[PDB]
Amino acid sequence: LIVTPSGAGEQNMIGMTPTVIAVHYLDETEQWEKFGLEKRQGALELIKKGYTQQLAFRQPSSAFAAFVKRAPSTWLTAYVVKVFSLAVNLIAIDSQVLCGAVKWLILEKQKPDGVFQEDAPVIHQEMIGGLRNNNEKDMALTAFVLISLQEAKDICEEQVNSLPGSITKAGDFLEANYMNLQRSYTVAIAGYALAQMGRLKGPLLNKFLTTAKDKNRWEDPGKQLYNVEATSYALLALLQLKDFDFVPPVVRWLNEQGGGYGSTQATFMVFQALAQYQKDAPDHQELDVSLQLPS
């Protein structure tokens, strides 16, 4: 077939993504009844397999790369943190693994002004969604990594005393440069990261809200998938703000839009966003998990 790289430490995470986020979605919306509760247990074992397999790509630093002889990726390590965080009450996640990865990010990859830097890009660039785009990478990657740190905060605050300060520093950098942002993608991902901290207010909030088109989506010219991802981030930001009036058209647009090549991020983010929408929003609209959780 086609010649393509085989970075298994990345490819296992691509494989793990649908099962984890599907289980997340069904747990959060409490919809296992319709889907079939008997299926949950097998999904849990599949997640456990993915997790256990990922451990072999955990390097002595606690960071992750596609290959054990390749330098660890900042993005991949943060993605692992985010995925493993969603799984902590689904299976036994070793805290040293999760919190070790968090601490490496903080002690090695964060720059003095709060920015997170990638020194060894993932080989499978399709798995990183909108991030693949060149510009505003310092803001976009810092937001991505900060979001992962936010997911690990409660689990790891006790193991990693430096965590809250790293979060605040990354938050400082996002806030200081948000107004100069031009891409809708960055506006949405950084908007979510800031909103989670209660730091998306004033002119920043205005920019975020007014960056949308037709008050229903955040999009930039290019791959449609990146807009589905951006808009899911924006939906999550709206839910942090509890701005339930702006919400309905966004959810309609998202639902009117899942898998294949380059769909890791879209799949993860859509299911996360729509899951939280149904969990939070009073009298939510009616909204297929079968594709993520086959047989």
Partner: protein, 122 residues
């Protein structure tokens, strides 16, 4: 005489996973964030239920783009952050002359403090 969890430091952390309780004469070490400089003994020791003093993390300097501009200077050997203790070299922008003291084009970053030279139109 047991100790309890080692103390936090700004811009750094211990190199081990923390314990709930720490035996007498046990030790842990600290590491600073990237580009920060450890000042003091990086190791602390438990004894008589108390920890010895933890190190400090000296700030790097974040080279202003641009206070460099309103001082009419740029970086020589162009390629920024510099570590505590590193020297950084500047040049006057074209058509300008050094208006600060004779030596001020080479300066040393220390704990977040950097003294910029200034130039003025000739």
């Amino acid at each position: 005489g047991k100790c309890g969890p080692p103390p936090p430091i700004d811009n750094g952390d211990i190199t081990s996973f923390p314990l709930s309780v720490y035996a007498p004469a046990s030790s842990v070490e600290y590491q600073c964030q990237n580009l920060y400089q450890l000042e003091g003994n990086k190791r602390i020791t438990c004894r008589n239920g108390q920890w010895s003093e933890p190190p400090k993390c000296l700030h790097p300097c974040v080279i202003s783009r641009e206070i460099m501009e309103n001082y009419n200077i740029a970086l020589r050997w162009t390629a920024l952050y510099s570590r505590t203790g590193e020297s950084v070299e500047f040049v006057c922008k074209r058509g300008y002359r050094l208006s600060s003291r004779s030596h001020t084009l080479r300066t040393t970053c220390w704990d977040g403090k950097l003294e910029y030279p200034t130039c003025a139109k000739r």
